[PDB]
Amino acid sequence: NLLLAFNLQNALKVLCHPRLHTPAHTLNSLNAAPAPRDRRETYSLQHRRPNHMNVLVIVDEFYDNKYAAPVTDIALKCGLPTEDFLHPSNYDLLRLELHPLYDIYIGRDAGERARHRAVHRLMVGNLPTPLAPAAFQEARGQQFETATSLAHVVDQAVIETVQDTAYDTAYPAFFYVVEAMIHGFEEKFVMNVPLVSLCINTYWERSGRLAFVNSFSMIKFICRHLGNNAISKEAYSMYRKIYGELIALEQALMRLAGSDVVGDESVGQYVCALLDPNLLPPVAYTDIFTHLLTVSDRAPQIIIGNEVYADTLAAPQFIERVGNMDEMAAQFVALYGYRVNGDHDHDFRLHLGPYVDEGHADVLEKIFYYVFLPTCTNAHMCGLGVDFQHVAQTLAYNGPAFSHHFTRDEDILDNLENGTLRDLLEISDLRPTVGMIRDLSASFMTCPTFTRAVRVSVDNDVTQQLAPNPADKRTEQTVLVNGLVAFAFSERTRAVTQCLFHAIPFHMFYGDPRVAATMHQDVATFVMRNPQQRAVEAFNRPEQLFAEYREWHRSPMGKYAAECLPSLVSISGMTAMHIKMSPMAYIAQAKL
Amino acid sequence: IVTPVTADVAYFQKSNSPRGRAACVVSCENYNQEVAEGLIYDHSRPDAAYEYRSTVNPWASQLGSLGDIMYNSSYRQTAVPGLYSPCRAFFNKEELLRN
Amino acid sequence: NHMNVLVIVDEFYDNKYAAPVTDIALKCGLPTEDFLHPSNYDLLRLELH
């Protein structure tokens, strides 16, 4: 008659054994079974690699003439409730959930005998909803926050403001043009401070919404420099609180991992996916890849189109370092001539800037891109590709640029000829000065030519690398180079803006049928043909860009984010939902 | 005997030895001083009364801790003789070992 | 020996490759029920007084 407790740790002697995290025995007992499956779905099984570097042809050909579109297995498993799941009229889905950690799937029957492949479930949140519904993980995130004593800087008003921006559809496409041309350099940002100052002032005074919340780079730069007299303050408090919360999430995540370390490295790498270095943010403007190759012990194979990448030594032969604009004072003409004399299709070389160690381990970029954005916006965003030469031609070939007569400081709209920039400025309801367009056309010298897409392949941790087949030891991820994410567009906007931009399906949080059908005519046709596609999970992206199995964030993370509530409780939920389900993560969960 | 503020109330609710570890030496094999010492004075292994924990107040349980300093017999050897000590019967090594 | 403190700090943090973590900064990390556990005996060994 002693009251004995039995917590997680006391049983840990059986949970951290590698017998638990191995799919070899599951795969044996499965493969040997008769009656293979008779439904070996093939969609999104593995990535397909292109020869042509252009993504516009990829998206066009993939959505050009489309028909009945398949939906993946996990997107179906995460749709049923628990009680409807366990009912034995949905059996083929139960039949493929033998093991909690390994998500298993069957290949195409033709070509070889029946075989099944298991891919590891990287994080807690990829556990399907009928086995861990949304409310469970909401409460678990609340519990985590109470454990680490994290104090929310962000107030709900700033989140409601972010969301009211996310559902604007009256968003100025010109603020988007500027945000696209800057592409994350300090010097060009300091070149154009009065431009964005006027922009933020007008967008915060005409309506109660704040612009430029899209790219993490503009947020960092505004908090870093324009904290001064930038705008009418009231708006600066928003950016203050945003960056403060971005740092407080890392305060908590560091407090989760112990002070104790494995060897030279700490243990914080293995417990949360955000803290791990091998994860890459979707929008990249600096040289992150080669730095990753320098830091990654596990073979971090990069794929640029058809061309592989595995060595720091080939750094010149595949990556063109974009010089600092001043150092390039002499090399402008050769760069410009390369556009007319160089075939950008299948270039297989990347134009990137020199890397800057922020001094944070890039945790902030991952936290803003993976937790804050999909929660505060219900994940309604896409990637965007741009043709920068059209942007230059719209900006520089304008009337006020050439005429030596026109003064430096005037309302361009009075002297503006009929051209697409007129319509853009009018729909963006902002009247800019001549100096600002001069500075924008000046920023052309550095800017890249087109936007590019890259694949990363990182081996898992040594704690979960136990697997039968080497292909499963890899984990795949997509990275955007020289591009930006976008909110929903308008229809009247997509008359002068289609002249410059195009839509991209992306990471689950940044893949959305609403936005992509808004931008593309063809994706709109596709969604109208098949309305069930409205959901973020059932959307079909080109395998050349997206593979639903072999990713960090599976479908259920996106499904939860679709119904995510804008409170900070759900922010805690999305934060804690990034734990890796590795034994050394179970130990840290036991400690707290 | 001083005691951490995080001692569980349930531990004092049930009859137990005030050391914070089980001190039932009859259980071990007879005449094994090493085994008896490993039962009484060790913290490499949890006490026999509660496996999940090792000791409720380590300030009295381990060798040379505060309670051991106060109420061990012949360790003082200079206290006044003639005054009974209720805690002496619990913390004395020779008496614990004679059972 | 030298009283110039800027050299002191820069000499400490210049090429530091191993960071030692003190003892008591380990105890304040663990909570109570995890502190008493017999999986952690190095730290508890020195909690006598």
Partner: peptide
């Protein structure tokens, strides 16, 4: 190898028990 050894250290993996207050211990499975 060191990851395995650290997991072994934290988990409590490995005798006899000196004194048994209740009786024959009964194993538990999860």
């Amino acid at each position: 190898q060191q990851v395995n050894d650290y997991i072994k250290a934290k988990v409590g993996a490995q005798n006899g028990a000196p004194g048994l207050c209740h009786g024959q211990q009964a194993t538990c499975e999860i």
